[PDB]
Symmetry: T
Subunit: 70 residues, 12 copies
């Protein structure tokens, strides 16, 4: 690596099934329309409540991928 | 949302199961008293150990709800 | 101050009229039933949107007041 | 929210008329070509000067919007 | 611990005799009117001056205790 | 900028008329005897109270200016 | 405790099955060779991606234990 | 500067040479696409190792540019 | 407090006695020059060691005072 | 120094008699078995409470020392 | 050290030749008109761009020196 | 990885020739005695000054490596 640049994106996964589901969900959505993802760093784990249960988990994470062509 | 006001307190949720559990359990007691929980936010994930096993996951949280009374 | 023992709570004042407004309402609402609020400290400035205009600013502030000693 | 996958970007709105103004323009300009901006979050309040008067305030804010899922 | 929840409170101890006195003082006031306290985490050590000496030490700390009944 | 060596100092502007006001006075007062202030950066927004109304906002800001080089 | 002194080392747990597993996994290792660990503290949650899906989570935490005998 | 708006993204610059190189290289690709880079800000300096030698310096950066279109 | 302005500088206080001493000593010299010290704030507690004894406690502080001149 | 390299370990000092004692206490231990410690840095000040009073303070710090000979 | 106080100043070095040049440059300017400097701690590494290259590196650092006379 | 577990130690690199050298220097040492280090992470950049010039930089970072075999 001497000329390998990365782009760091921010997404917020959500799911009623917990942190891992949320992380997993958000990530599939990125890789979906984005080029080979490489890593993710969680920024925060939030949430909304209804009856008094976690309506949905919100896991903000930073996602990195490589840029290439030429 | 006209000009409501919110209250943010800090509860520590605990469970042997894991993070999700600890949070869910923590939010359980908080709601059992309070005034429709609107949102929560994880401050940290700690845990107590006995030997080579997690005794209890400790997920400290910030929960916000309504205070827009009169 | 040698017997002075203060208590710091957290609140989130909202307002469609900016930070100043959001701060002002929150604190007003707070005292409107609570004690003699001494000071406040801004934790974060956020907001919810609709189009490209802030429906309401969200200033969460830590507030403190002198407790009772005898 | 279980399919909701948001994207948080960062912007810096400027204004010679204070924080409120700087925040307002930034977000307006943002949506003026972008999607349905959900929320925003203040990262920093800065400013460039000339004499002893703020030429323009600089509010950098993280902004998020719902992505597309199907 | 599977169903052991905690509440995290904020107090500001004060004393002219230093950090430890301040911590000690504030804590006695909490335990005084509060249920069995469990731990405290210092948040900040501030102070006010008179002749040029620490009029009073201010040690903000977070205090945790257990919630129980049934 | 290769000889430009700036000095960053910290100040706290106060005002009963909100953040904007507090920021404005502080900087004005600063230059009213000091050099050519280049930029400023908000450290914290606080305030002292009386009833439930801010007696004066307290914006502490880091300010910088170009030093002298020859 | 009374005069106990503890060491805080820093490990990183990894697992294909989420935070809990990585947390649990990492500790087991520390326990395999270290005297009764007392507590852990999550420092971060990251993960490598060899594709659209998660290759495996990485939970980095600080583990604390005592030391005294003679 | 009337009331322009800026965009801040995050790139990771890499180089075996060192920090300076990694940043310079990172900024190279960022500019090669974007819209006159105004400023950058280092978020962290990381690096990959093979044995007893630095494989690649990794300087993550925040780059800001213009978005004041219409 | 009409619309005063304050100045915040950073001194490092030192003492073999302990934290309290180091701070008290640090504030001593600061005041011996400056302009009625209003408040202080501890930034960190460090210390130098020779062998198995604390050589000197180092408490870095932020001291604020008046600058509301004309 | 010139080409020295240091290790930073992390210990936790505890004492029934305040911060100083815990700080002092903890170090002594590190010194008891580690080659001339050079510096320490307070990371936190916490404490357990078995009642209204402080059972004992807990001061967690990072201790640094060198390593070179051959 | 029982009565050794320090002052902590803030400067922003600049240079087109990288972080080290910038650090080096800013420091010479301080020591130039200031009394024996003792240490510096980097606060941030920023920069401005022209053609798309680092017009100049900006390294904000905190500089410490001793105060003495009598 | 799959079930790997890593240790993060913390070293400090020093050099008369800037950040790179100190970074490079420090690591070499860790490598001299530690099994194939995998990654490093800059925690700070400081330096001692025995005069107007830099005596030598001090780069403190966290180095990570694995551990597993049996
Ligand atoms: Cl907090
Ligand atoms: Cl960020
Ligand atoms: Cl600071
Ligand atoms: Cl750390
Ligand atoms: Na989980
Ligand atoms: Na460099
Ligand atoms: Na003390």
């Amino acid at each position: 690596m001497s000329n390998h640049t990365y782009r760091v994106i921010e997404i917020v996964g959500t799911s009623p099934d917990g942190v891992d589901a949320a992380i997993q969900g958000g990530l599939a959505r990125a890789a979906q329309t984005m080029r080979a993802l490489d890593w993710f760093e969680v920024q925060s784990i939030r949430g909304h409540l209804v009856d008094g249960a976690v309506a949905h988990f919100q896991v903000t994470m930073k996602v990195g991928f490589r840029l290439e062509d030429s």
